[PDB]
Each structure stands twice: as structure tokens, then as C-alpha cells.
Structure 1
Amino acid sequence: VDMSNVVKTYDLQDGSKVHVFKDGKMGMENKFGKSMNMPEGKVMETRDGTKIIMKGNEIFRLDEALRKGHSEGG
């Protein structure tokens, strides 16, 4: 995964994990730490209570986090 090239990792309520990379892509793993492709068009939940989806090679993070949630860092 490399924690150096990821801006934020998302832990799914299912155990699976998503990472938004500093290169702009995203990587998904299952509750067993194994890498698998993230299904486009599907909105999924996190343990933290956020909803996310991969659409058009992008990532919706409640959408509005992309809207006005640009902080540069966090």
C-alpha cells in the first residue's frame, strides 16, 4: 500500500479497505488485507460512517469532501 503515497485510507464497515493515493488513484483491499479491484458505481460504507464510491476513475468521498473539502493535507 505504502503509507507514504496515500493521502487517506478508508476502512470499510465490512473490513475491506480503500486508499486514495497521492497519485490520484485508489486501491482496495478486502477484510483480509488482499488487493482487489473496486467496483464502479457501487457506494460502500466505512466503519467511520462515511459513504464512498468509485466512478469515472475517480472517488466520491461523500462527494462534498471533493466539493469544498480540499484542505491540502488534512
Structure 2
Amino acid sequence: VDMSNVVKTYDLQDGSKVHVFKDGKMGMENKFGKSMNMPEGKVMETRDGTKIIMKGNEIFRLDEALRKGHSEGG
């Protein structure tokens, strides 16, 4: 699993916060306990002024998962 070890949260200025997965891909998860399909390239700016582009536009990851080997075949 080691999922607990992995963690990422960029405080967006829109009150929301992106969350990346193991594939380094991002995840547009709104603080409203829901997801928001943000189109790739929609530059997101953190409160600290950190420029982060919506790389992983595939938010589908959040919605459940196939539970990969969390190791082999990264």
C-alpha cells in the first residue's frame, strides 16, 4: 500500500486544493468534498504563489480505483 506515505496538497487560491497520485499526476479535488473537472493547462496558483499546472486532468483516479500493485509496474 504505502499509500499513507504518499501525500500532496497545494492550497489553491480558489479555496480548493489539488492532490497528486503515485503517477505524479495531479487531482482537482474541491474542498467541497467533491471533484471538479479542470481542463488541462488551467494554471493553478497557490496562496504562496506557487505556479502549478493541472497536469493530471484525469480526476477519474479519485473516483475509486483498480487498486494497482502499488509497487510493481509503476
TM-score by length of 1: 0.55
**1:64–1:41: structure 2 CA closer, same or farther, 3 Å change rule?**
farther
Larger RCO (alpha carbons 8 Å, 6+ apart): 2
Structure 2, unmatched stretches of 5+, are none
Distance verdict in 2 for CA 1:3–1:11, change over 3 Å: farther
Q: Contact 2:10/2:19 (CA < 8 Å) preserved in 1?
A: yes
Q: CA deviation at 1:19?
A: 1.0
The normalised TM-score by structure 2 is 0.55
**Structure of higher CA gyration radius:** 2
- Please report the RMSD computed on the Cα atoms of aligned residues, expressed in angstroms: 9.1
Bigger strand fraction: 1
Give unmatched runs, 5+ long, in structure 1: none
The residue matched to 1:60 in structure 2 has which SS?
Answer: helix
User: Runs ≥4 in structure 1, deviation > 4 angstroms?
Assistant: 55-74
With over 3 angstroms needed to count, the CA separation of the structure-2 counterparts of 1:12 and 1:70, relative to structure 1, is farther
Using the aligned pairs only, state the percent identity: 100
Count of residue pairs brought into register by the alignment: 74
> Displacement of 1:7 after TM fit?
3.6
